[model samples]
Target: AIREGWFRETCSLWPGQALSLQVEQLLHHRRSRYQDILVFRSKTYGNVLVLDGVIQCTERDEFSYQEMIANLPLCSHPNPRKVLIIGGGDGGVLREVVKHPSVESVVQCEIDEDVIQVSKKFLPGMAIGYSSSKLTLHVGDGFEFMKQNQDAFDVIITDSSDPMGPAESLFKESYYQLMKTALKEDGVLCCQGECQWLHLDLIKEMRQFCQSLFPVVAYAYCTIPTYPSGQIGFMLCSKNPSTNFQEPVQPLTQQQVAQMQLKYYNSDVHRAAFVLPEFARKALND
Candidate 1:
């Protein structure tokens, strides 16, 4: 909520640490069936989206998160033809997904239809993904959708909200199991791993379980000012032992990077993202 023209994000998940934004004007607000949704014009960032009083993305830095999440897995996989995106109602990740020339079709499963409508109205830049002919939008529970479609997708990306409200189930072990069943035998999976500064324990738990399910599992991160630690990480798992999450098997050259209109992701960034700080490396790698 904004108090005196500024919205301070304070959550129990990251106690005592808060990131405040100067709210220029409140544009939209509503209580979706699953959680609270809010959008506003910011003094610094062009527009901001908030879910359940937490900062989801700010216009200035959203590309950093969206591009990394989508490209980390897409670029790493040799040929990502059929892709599945779970919980990316904002459409930013979908926007990035279609940029890969190898991807033939994409299926997005979002539980909340409200988030989609709101984004299309307010965040048209990000929501432009809806117009892509390759996209097939499915409005329902992602778990149910994956359960019905097994051994289908070559790349599965979970661009979920934080582990709360409607997204709580997405962070569980069962959800990963469902994703495993839904993916092709040699498929790649990437999920929204929370902040290392605040959720290292949670990240470690996810990595541990993912190790048991996939032959190769790795964690990578990106910097975004609005997210809890001014950073967020992604957990990548591959069913094929030959897959390397650290370096892209299908590396993008400068020409392709520019052609794709990428703001943050490149082949070198893809490799460097997996190189963590000593503390995080020791905690997760060990």
Candidate 2:
């Protein structure tokens, strides 16, 4: 017989044992051309987007993860006029991208149009990120879209899902080569680096590979409730030798935070995020 529990959902970022939350109701479910998509209301985390049994983001605290990843690189660059987002169909990344007033043009290339449509229907707060005049949504392949625009972007954020199936190639060295080529001479690229607590080896390998191409490569992390181990990591790469990804080039003042409604990221958080653990330091340092 099945257990008394009505429903349970878990994401694999944790391995073996994972954190889970009870589901109040199955909000929506669909089989997208690329992956399985599910939306549900949780007791604690509110609404959640599950892609292929993996939690992409939750309603309650999605801003923390999205803001940290988006602002970290944008603030690092002095003037990020042209920004490109690869695979952020949910629009949380786009929400954060438009907050930076310096950005003139923002491009989002998502392989799955269904993700965008579903988000626009189910998650309007996040979905509205695509409404601005600055954003140009391209319903197509990011690799191909990027190939056509060489040295086009000042900041590139790859808010790709975990390293599996369609999103897996984003972590490969060859794809990184393409990312480096798409960025301008002084461009800064930020991408999902998985969980440091879980994927330390993977982080080391990716960082070392990026180190060879970019002048500076560093790893940072932010807390997310649904993710494996309650946190996710980010890899920041800078093409300019003088650029410092850890410290924001234009540090935000208290007034700016209030004016922009920044919930999680701040000037101090930017540098603090990069202070990796001892084990991480030794591995990524090389």
Candidate 3:
């Protein structure tokens, strides 16, 4: 919702509180086939992308969410040769996915073409993932794509929007079951787990269902000012019992972090992301 020169995020999901950004100019606005897409240049946060009236990513802090979500699972897995990204039309997750030297093959499934085109035109810094030679782009439904490819990817990252609109099915138990079938024997999964400050009940429900499906399931998060409550979390699950989501199995050296141009995610950050607040820990653990 835009008022005057400010873009206000007033949604039912996070009631009583809203984050308003000073919009310098409206870059683009349209009602896509899947959801509403809003892009604008902010006074300080650079380019901002909002879907369904929620901030998806601001150019300034996108690295924190993108890097953590993509690297947490890719680095934890012993060898993530094949990677599949679902619903990350902006290509930020795809950009991070292709960074891993071990990744040989990468596939991305985005349901909406408008999101991809909008991002490529406005947020090219992230949309660069499309130019990579390793990527095989599939512009369609992610759930149906997973059904056809079973036991395929070593790491499957669902960089979806909140549990609403086109992304609602991505949060269902049936979707996780299909993802389990799509993953290899040692496959790892990472998804947008929503804000713990607001969606603890939803997170808890997801954790319970995920626990029954995967032997190793863990919750991790990163701080991003643009997201609701100034934070977002990831639900990490693995088919292998020995997979550790907290510590990166393939820890990057200081030099490697520089080489990869990673700004937020590192070995220490990966471990610390799993350390939750007392309130969240008790609820998720209980």
Candidate 4:
């Protein structure tokens, strides 16, 4: 058994890996749907956490996932007044959203109350965003919540896990339709597009779906150390055809940016985050 600060579990090795791996329970549970998600921390890599046996968060490197998933759409919008987050129980996305003062309120709908609790205890730095007044927590289904919120949000960020279990509906086209209804005419929505190395097929399908619904659909990538693959992707869909993304009119103040001490996101990085490589561009277009 391996018991430590944030997690507790047993170790093992698969047939083809050069690294030793262990699956353990987070001491403070964060996901309510799953009693104790299995977190696999690799000796060669970082951490792979599974909720109810579904892959959720990781420790290897999370900057890319947290950054591109939040900053891309946020920076694109002229002014995002109200933001809705689906399934980001860890609060990392919220941490970045609140950086923009234009965001008046951020409603985070996460079904798992335990995930919120666990993050606060184990990952205090990232979890601090939850304490802000700008944030509102709702423990419920994301799809249902969006269905009820019609033309309500200026920006919607889906910080969900892979397409499995509670997050399966999130990948469906129907959900995008609901999101279209929930967002204001000029609203922008960004979702985790999955890893480039492992889930390119899923990303391609999602891109096609978004293109069919919204007038403007874009794809971007970032490097997350803790994910299955070091590279992760995000899909940005917008209701307005003319919506143009420029640098934040009032970019992050040096002091404000300094406050977070982010590993990946910066003013310059925000614009570059959307620049896709040749292969990724070809994959989405194909």
Go through the candidates in order and give the C-alpha RMSD of each one to the true structure: 1.0, 2.0, 1.0, 4.4
Q: What is the C-alpha local distance difference test score of each model?
A: 0.89, 0.83, 0.91, 0.71
Model 4: per-residue Cα lDDT over 213-264, one tens digit each: 9998877777754444456677788998876543443356567667766667
Ranking by lDDT: 3, 1, 2, 4
Worst 10 residues of 1 by lDDT: 163-172
Deviating ranges (above 4 Å) for candidate 4:
1-32, 38-49, 53-55, 58-60, 245-256
Q: How many clashing residue pairs, candidate 3? A: 0
Better of 1 and 2 by TM-score: 1
TM-score of 1: 0.98
Cα lDDT of model 1 by residue, 1-286, tens digit: 6899999999899998888999889999999998899999999998998989887777788899889999999988888899999988889999999988899999999999999999898888899999999999998877777788788999999887767778877756888889999889999999888789888898898899899999999999999888888898998999999998897998899999999999999999999999898999999877
Check candidate 1 and list the clashing pairs: none
Better of 1 and 4 by TM-score: 1
Taking all chains together, the TM-score of candidate 2 against the true structure is 0.94
Instruction: List ranges where model 2 is wrong by over 4 Å.
Output: 1-13
For lDDT, candidate 1 versus 3, the one ahead is: 3
Q: On a 0 to 100 scale, what is the lDDT of residue 56 in model 1?
A: 74
Q: What residue runs in model 1 are displaced by over 4 Å at the alpha carbon? A: none
Top lDDT hit:
3
Number of backbone collisions per candidate: 0, 0, 0, 8
